[PDB]
């Protein structure tokens, strides 16, 4: 298996996300949401919150275990490896989203600590995974916020109705997990939850 850096994604986006139109833009949302959904399917976290921010960025927050906060090789955080190397690694498409974003932030909460790493300009880390604060030991989760790269996509406008429909469908497949969407541009909001 040949590993590659994020440049490879930026030079052939359609190979990873299908296109660079609205469909491809929204593929970025699906990749991050799917990470949260996979974690919930494994039994960790009962709500997944999606927010379309006023600045055009998008946030997905889960309440799962939190990504591992330890080191890979050479003092490089596991989180950094997941977000900057691909074949995406270990079952997530986070690296593809990072590659196609002008910036991305990942915040992890677990073990009484809050950690954050920031990437810019197609996934170049501008910080390490830094402890930024504390939380109760019972608090766990992962939050990812990204700004899609306007130099790549023909549209960077997230569509509320498109996201709403997909999250509704995901809530129906998952069961017993609340999927929420909030649009800070318009104040629109909706939640989905299907019991079984």
Ligand X SMILES: CCNC(=O)c1cc2c(-n3ccc(C(F)(F)F)n3)c(-c3cncc(C(=O)O)c3)cnc2[nH]1
Report in angstroms how near the CB of residue 139 gets to ligand X at its nearest: 13
Closest distance of CB 170 from ligand X, Å: 13
Q: By CB under 6 A, name the one of 9, 40, 52, 64 that touches ligand X.
A: 64
Positions in 116-145 near ligand X (CB under 6 A): 142-144
Nearest residue (CB) to ligand X, 81 versus 190: 81
CB 33, min distance to ligand X, A: 7
Out of 28, 58, 62, 86, the only residue in the binding site for ligand X (CB under 6 A) is 62
Q: Is 90 in the site for ligand X (CB under 6 A)?
A: yes
Ramachandran angles phi, psi of 60, nearest 5°:
-120, 125
Q: How far is the CB of 154 from ligand X (least distance, A)?
A: 26
Residue among 10, 35, 117, 158 that touches ligand X (CB under 6 A): 35
* Cα 59 to Cα 47: distance, rounded to the nearest angstrom: 14
For residue 95, CA distances in Å to 125, 162, 179, 182 come to 12, 23, 23, 25
- By the 8 A CB rule, do 105 and 92 touch? no
> In the chain, which residues are followed by a C-to-N distance beyond 2.5 Å, i.e. a gap?
87
3-state secondary structure of 96: helix
CB 167 within 8 A of CB 181: yes
List contacts with ligand X (CB under 6 A): 32, 35-36, 39, 60-62, 64-65, 67-68, 78, 82, 90-92, 94, 142-144
């Amino acid at each position: 298996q040949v590993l590659e850096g994020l440049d490879a994604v930026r030079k052939r986006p359609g190979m990873y996300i299908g296109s660079t139109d609205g469909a491809g833009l929204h593929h970025l949302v699906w990749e991050i949401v799917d990470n949260a959904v996979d974690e919930a399917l494994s039994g960790f976290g009962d709500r997944i919150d999606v927010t379309i921010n006023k600045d055009g960025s998008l946030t997905v927050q889960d309440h799962g275990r939190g990504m591992p906060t330890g080191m890979h090789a050479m003092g490089i955080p596991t989180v950094e490896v997941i977000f900057t190397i691909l074949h995406g690694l270990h079952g997530v498409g986070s690296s593809v989203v990072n590659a196609l974003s002008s910036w991305l932030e990942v915040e992890i909460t677990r073990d009484g600590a809050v950690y954050k790493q920031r990437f810019e300009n197609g996934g170049k880390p501008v910080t390490t995974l830094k402890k930024i604060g504390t939380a109760l030991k019972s608090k766990t989760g992962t939050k990812v916020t990204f700004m899609p790269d306007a130099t790549i996509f023909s549209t960077t406008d997230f569509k509320y109705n498109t996201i709403s429909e997909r999250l509704n469908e995901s809530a129906f497949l998952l069961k017993n997990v609340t999927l929420s969407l909030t649009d800070k541009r318009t104040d629109e909001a909706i939640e989905f939850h299907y019991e079984n």
